[PDB]
Write a protein that binds this ligand. Structure first.
Ligand SMILES: Nc1ncnc2c1ncn2[C@@H]1O[C@H](COP(=O)(O)CP(=O)(O)OP(=O)(O)O)[C@@H](O)[C@H]1O
Lengths: 200, 985, 212
DNA sequence: GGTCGTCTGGCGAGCGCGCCGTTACACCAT
RNA sequence: GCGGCGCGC
DNA sequence: ATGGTGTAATCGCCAGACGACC
């Protein structure tokens, strides 16, 4: 899967996976989702307190924020980060694009807790437009929102939300007018990863 | 097979030969011969070099020792070794028995004495010494006689080199002694490479502060010179002590030049260094290139080539001089070769690591050997700063800000040029080889190439000798034209330049006149829009100020060179690009430039106007005005007659009158023409007036003209003026009319796109696209050309112009397909052939019909060809070879009639009396170039060249299917161009 | 005011008690093509001083897996120390043409703050700090105008001056001095700036913050 | 590793000449 | 050799 | 005048590689 997954990975190790963390980051918020092999969502969360993108880049503050965010996350066998697809030629995208790489870089260094010994990659990145073409959210060259798709999924469904599903429904009804897309994109990215990579 | 250290040692030994340091090279040779692990690097070339040096010196015992060392090594002696031994025997006379035994031993190895005498790089003196030795041994041996030079027997070039035809070759207007002293001036100017030219910027009055700054500069420069001398002396001492031990060093390379010359070159490089510095590697490369060039120039005065060049140039100047007559008139190159020929030699460059090491050593010497007071202990001037340049980190030599401050204060009024970027003060040497040529002492190249491109000059050196004689002679003839400065135009240009210049005419403005950002009263933090627009205004003002400063710098350089060349006669040598198009060697001041450069230049020799000179001057003036471009010549002359008052007023009062000449497209050339016409009309006899002004005849579009000639298209030729007509036919007006016809048909669909565009069809919209069809423009680029012109005009939509642009591109392309069909057939065939050749893995190569080989250099990063560039460049490059062939034929046949002919591509310039004759030569050679089958000869050459490989037989057949399908010719005869009045006009 | 100078010098806020009681540091200076580091004791002794010059980075794409692999390979050779000092460049987001370098400088540092700062999850205290290069140049008088100049001559004075003189700044051990001089003499035609900046930053940290 | 149908990023008018400059801007300070 | 401009065909 | 300084936010076609088969 060279075109779908950016790091090279063996398919045999891809097939034998238990649960995956899917992480989506934006300028102001982080969201992630813990989803297992049986397509049942174990966790789905986003954080509001960010304290970054205030005009001063500082690696210590980034380290503190990513450490605090990672401390909440449960353990899994693979961490799927998004790929934004922006180009280095566009100057106006410079203040944002840098942020993504920084947030990507630490997320490779902080989450590969055993890379020093074994030398195996536990964190992967998958292309966004492939997910959009799979879910048919691509109108023209730009992906559309996924609020309708996640409302249809949660309300033989692809995702099997559990006892805890009432809390997820309360979160979904909680200020849905707010510009939150990372929470939807993490879940749909996890579903797309489980469909394209380990299935069929 | 050659290691880097082996190249270092070979360059070391060659430099020791050049600097006459044979004991030192002998010491290094024997110390490397002592150790067994070092002898694997040693090569027979090194032994032959040391043998040749000992032979030139005259030491027989050391030579025999080197033979003993070669025998101990076990190598086989080379023929050049025996040639060096014979040279040593000749220089130091000995008994004939030993030399006879040496010849017998050479004969036992199977070597040939003829192979010793010829095809060896040894100089004429060495050959003479070897011949003396052989004559001492065997007087029966003699060299074969020298054959007479071959004559080119090409069909197109037969009339140029025919002895039976009557010839009247032109001669210069200057006597012999004047040309001799001009030669002396040029030699003394080229011996010292730098040339100092007084600036044309208005000077500043010298205050006391500037005089103090200049005195401090002088004292600092004296201390710097002495410190550099001491540092160079101690560096030479320690490097010699290093060479005494068994190690390689750069001592002979530092001994290559005199100490004073090296210190002067380093001081010049220090002076030329900008405020913000340049990369260390760039300075190293410039230092190495400069010291190599100075060695090449200064070696000849020691070896005595300067005196031989002086004598042979003095003998050769009789052909060009007015008061001297040769026994039989001939071409300048043939006269140069008929006399004694000074043997110019191709020079072998040093290896790149040696060059880089020498440059870095000299730059380090400059950094460490220069100190200044801060103004207080001494502090260095130059420092190493790691800074970001381009997208990469690099080291930079940065000067002290006090040095930059003292350079800015008390600004020097002088500028520095090289001896190769200034016009020649003497007539140039004839072009006799791809390497020998125009400049007296500086090395020359026939074809301009990028760095590392040696295929162009290697394919040019394997052709038959006669093939380039058509081109070289033309390149000599274009070099023999004598130029001068107009003078009256230069005064007005300098008057506008030193004051606030007029950018409408083409004179840049001083930085004081540059705009400034508006004053700000509102706080920046009050509104983001206010600070944003202030920042944008500042960033635009800085950019336009930088552009204005660059333009003023270019104008200052050009006008300073022009002022230097005032009241003196100079020659512009010419070379070629990789396709055969000719360009002048001096880049700044030449006739291939803007209005000012073309108006400052006049002919040194003058010719009487004659019966039809004034009319041609008037037609040239009307052509330069541009007011009558679609009118016949008679109406142009009538317009010239009815506007004579404006011409006289402009000539008498260029800047304090009605200023009519400013309304023309080319105002400076227009003013020159008005002055020249004013003097002629006011003369006693208009016919007897002597005119130096060049008159220009141009063609509409050589791309479509040559494509029509190749395809013999009946309807294309009418458009491109290859068929006789009373009124000139413009391609742009015709294509615009066809496009407007197509828009009327659109009434069927009634599209909004058509009806908004109905009024605004114009020649201006389609002119750029039709002139760029020749260069293989795509529909996207045609859109990017049409959309701009739609943007300036106030079209009805003013938006969704994207929809309007695509339809216009499609209709102009359909109209140009119906007007030009054979043209696009030939372009498609050429593109397909280029694609199929590039896919097989080779670059496209073709021979110009005058015999010049052309190879297309585009390649990827033993590299692979760039298929896209090779595919998209062949149809434009092929036409330019045809244009240069016709221009060279016109030059070579105008020279036989005593005509002063110069060319700025597509434009032929000559005296006003000699225009009509040139026009015949312009047309009679167009019919003779295209009478011969160009396309079928090209097809046969391409088949023979690119389809002779036994491998890939299927691909070979696929290539031959396309290559042997030339487009079918049409039905327009090519012999009626001779009656076309507007072919070249 | 002294705390203001240390805040201008050092990016992460570190109390004086931990800065005063250090024992060993590692100074690291990285570039597009090369990285260098030097390890120094409280009594200033260069225990090791090393360079890495062959990278796959800064060749076209920006893939973070290759960055992680290369940084892990470099860090594996590094010994342990109390503090890890990193160089801070003056590049800003305003210079767009220099953005490809800046991106690089922001990726590696992001990994060097992550991989080197072990036990940050438990302890919660910083161990990697960034020091401005202009302040170090001003301390060593290597600043001409606004451009900091090279310090090859100062390092040559530190290394090849075998006389005791009076109060030397840095001590090179007798066992490793020959290899140090060999490395200095080998890279003379091609100047390796990071190898000099690492030692200069180590001395500047041990003088301006420690032993203040 | 060799090959085929495809698809997906990329470049879109040829030669030849030049100049100038390689974080920017208001403050500070003088 | 990489950016901003200008010129000629 | 000079000189240092403290700050950041809408085309549309072509040539070389990708996956399955060998
Ligand atoms: N053969 C050519 N190829 C490419 N560009 C050319 C060209 N001839 C001229 N140009 C460029 O096109 C510009 C405009 O051409 P013009 O100055 O209008 C002379 P023209 O092309 O013959 O139009 P005309 O027939 O109305 O005189 C020139 O200034 C020059 O930069």
């Amino acid at each position: 899967l060279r075109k779908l997954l950016k790091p090279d990975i063996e398919r045999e190790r891809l097939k034998a996976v238990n649960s995956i963390i899917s992480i989506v980051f934006g300028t102001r918020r982080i969201a992630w989702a813990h989803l297992d092999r049986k397509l049942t969502v174990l966790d789905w969360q986003q954080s509001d307190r960010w304290s970054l993108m205030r005009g001063i880049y500082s690696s210590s503050v980034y380290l503190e924020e990513i450490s605090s965010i990672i401390s909440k996350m449960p353990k899994a066998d693979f961490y799927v980060l998004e790929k934004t697809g922006l180009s280095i030629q566009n100057s106006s995208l410079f203040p944002i694009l840098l942020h993504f790489h920084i947030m990507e870089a630490m997320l490779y260094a902080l989450l590969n807790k055993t890379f020093a010994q074994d030398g195996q990659h536990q964190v992967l990145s998958m292309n966004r437009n492939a997910v959009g073409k799979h879910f048919e959210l691509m109108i023209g060259d730009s992906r559309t929102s996924g609020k309708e798709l996640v409302k249809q999924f949660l309300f033989d469904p692809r995702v099997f939300f559990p006892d805890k599903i009432v809390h997820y429904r309360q979160m979904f009804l909680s200020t849905e007018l707010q510009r939150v897309e990372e929470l939807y994109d993490s879940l749909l990215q996890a579903i797309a990863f489980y469909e394209l990579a380990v299935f069929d | 097979q050659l290691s880097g250290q082996q190249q270092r040692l070979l360059a070391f030994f060659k430099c020791c030969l050049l600097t006459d340091q044979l004991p030192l090279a002998h010491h290094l040779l024997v110390v490397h011969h002592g150790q067994r692990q070092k002898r694997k690097l040693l090569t027979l070339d090194m032994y032959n070099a040391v043998m040749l040096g000992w032979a030139r010196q005259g030491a027989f015992k050391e030579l025999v020792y080197v033979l003993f060392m070669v025998k101990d090594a076990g190598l086989t002696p080379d023929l050049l070794s025996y040639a060096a031994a014979l040279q040593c025997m000749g220089r130091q006379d000995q008994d004939a028995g030993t030399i006879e035994r040496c010849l017998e031993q050479m004969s036992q190895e199977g070597l040939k004495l003829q192979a010793l005498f010829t095809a060896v790089l040894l100089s004429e003196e060495d050959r003479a010494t070897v011949l003396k030795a052989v004559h001492k041994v065997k007087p029966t041996f003699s060299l074969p006689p020298q054959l007479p030079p071959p004559v080119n027997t090409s069909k197109l070039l037969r009339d140029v080199y025919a002895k039976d035809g009557r010839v009247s070759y032109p001669k210069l207007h200057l006597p012999l002694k004047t040309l001799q002293c001009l030669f002396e001036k040029q030699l003394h100017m080229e011996l010292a490479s730098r040339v100092c030219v007084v600036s044309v910027e208005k000077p500043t009055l010298p205050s006391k502060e500037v005089k103090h700054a200049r005195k401090t500069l002088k004292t600092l420069r004296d201390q710097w010179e002495k410190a550099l001398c001491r540092a160079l002396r101690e560096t030479k001492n320690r490097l010699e002590r290093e060479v005494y031990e068994g190690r390689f060093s750069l001592y002979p390379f530092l001994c290559l030049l005199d100490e004073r010359e090296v210190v002067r070159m380093l001081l010049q490089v220090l002076q030329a260094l900008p405020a913000q510095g340049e990369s260390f590697t760039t300075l190293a490369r410039e230092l190495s290139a400069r010291t190599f060039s100075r060695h090449v120039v200064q070696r000849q005065r020691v070896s005595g080539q300067v005196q031989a060049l002086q004598n042979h140039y003095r003998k050769y100047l009789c052909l060009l001089a007015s008061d001297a007559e040769v026994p039989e008139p001939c071409l300048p190159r043939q006269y140069w070769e008929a006399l004694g020929a000074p043997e110019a030699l191709r020079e072998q460059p040093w290896p790149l690591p040696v060059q880089m090491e020498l440059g870095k050593l000299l730059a380090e010497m400059l950094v460490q050997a220069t100190q200044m007071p801060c103004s207080s202990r001494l502090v260095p001037v130059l420092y190493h700063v790691y800074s970001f340049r381009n997208v990469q980190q690099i080291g930079i030599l940065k000067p002290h800000p006090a040095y930059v401050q003292l350079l800015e204060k008390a600004a020097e009024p002088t500028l520095t040029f090289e001896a190769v970027d200034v016009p020649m003060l003497c007539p140039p040497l004839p072009w006799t080889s791809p390497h020998s040529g125009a400049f007296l002492l500086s090395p020359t190249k026939l074809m301009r190439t990028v760095e590392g491109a040696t295929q162009h000059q290697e394919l040019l050196e394997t052709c038959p000798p006669t093939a380039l004689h058509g081109a070289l002679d033309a390149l000599t003839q274009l070099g023999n034209c004598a130029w001068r400065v107009n003078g009256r135009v230069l005064d007005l240009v300098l008057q506008l330049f030193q004051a606030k210049g007029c950018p409408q005419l083409g004179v840049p403005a001083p930085p004081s006149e540059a705009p400034q950002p508006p004053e700000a009263h509102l706080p920046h933090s009050a509104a983001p829009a206010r600070k944003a627009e202030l920042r944008r205004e500042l960033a635009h003002c800085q950019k336009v100020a930088r552009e204005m400063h660059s333009l003023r710098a270019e104008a200052l350089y050009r006008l300073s060179l022009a002022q230097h060349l005032r009241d003196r006669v100079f020659w512009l040598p010419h070379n070629m690009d990789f396709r055969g198009r000719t360009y002048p060697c001096p880049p700044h001041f030449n006739h291939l430039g803007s209005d000012v450069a073309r108006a400052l230049l006049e002919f040194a020799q003058g010719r009487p106007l004659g019966p039809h000179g004034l009319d041609w001057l008037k037609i040239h003036l009307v052509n330069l005005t541009g007011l009558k471009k679609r009118e016949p010549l008679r109406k142009r002359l009538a317009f010239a007659e009815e506007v004579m008052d404006d011409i006289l007023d402009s000539a008498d009062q260029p800047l304090t009158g009605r200023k009519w000449w400013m309304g023309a497209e080319e105002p400076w050339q227009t003013l020159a023409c008005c002055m020249e016409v004013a003097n002629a009309v006011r003369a006693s006899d208009p016919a007897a007036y002597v005119s130096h002004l060049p008159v220009h005849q141009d063609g509409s579009c050589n791309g479509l003209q040559h494509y029509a000639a190749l395809g013999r298209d009946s309807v294309g030729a009418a458009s491109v003026n290859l068929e006789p007509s009373d009124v000139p036919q413009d391609v742009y007006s015709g294509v615009a009319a066809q496009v407007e016809v197509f828009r009327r048909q659109d009434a069927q669909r009634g599209m909004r796109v058509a009806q908004v565009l109905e009024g605004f069809i114009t020649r201006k919209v389609v002119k750029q696209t039709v002139m760029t069809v020749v260069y293989g423009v795509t529909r996207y680029g045609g859109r990017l050309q049409i959309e701009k012109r739609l943007r300036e005009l106030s079209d009805f939509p003013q938006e969704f112009v994207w929809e309007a642009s695509h339809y216009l591109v499609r209709q102009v392309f359909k109209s140009l397909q119906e007007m030009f069909s054979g043209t696009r057939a030939i372009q498609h065939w050429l593109t397909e052939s280029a694609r199929l050749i590039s896919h097989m893995g080779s670059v496209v190569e073709w021979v110009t019909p005058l015999g010049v080989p052309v190879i297309q250099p585009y390649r990827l990063d033993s590299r692979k060809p760039n298929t896209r560039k090779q595919k998209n460049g062949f149809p434009p490059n092929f036409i330019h070879s045809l244009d240069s062939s016709h221009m060279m034929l016109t030059a070579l046949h105008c020279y036989r009639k005593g005509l002063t002919f110069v060319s700025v591509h597509d434009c032929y310039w000559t005296h006003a009396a000699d225009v009509s004759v040139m026009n015949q030569v312009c047309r009679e050679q167009f019919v003779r170039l295209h009478s011969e089958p160009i396309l079928q000869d090209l097809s046969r050459f391409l088949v023979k060249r690119f389809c002779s490989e036994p491998q890939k037989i299927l691909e070979a057949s696929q290539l031959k299917e396309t290559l042997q399908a030339v487009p079918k010719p049409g039905a327009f005869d090519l012999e009626q161009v001779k009656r076309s009045t507007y072919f070249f006009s």
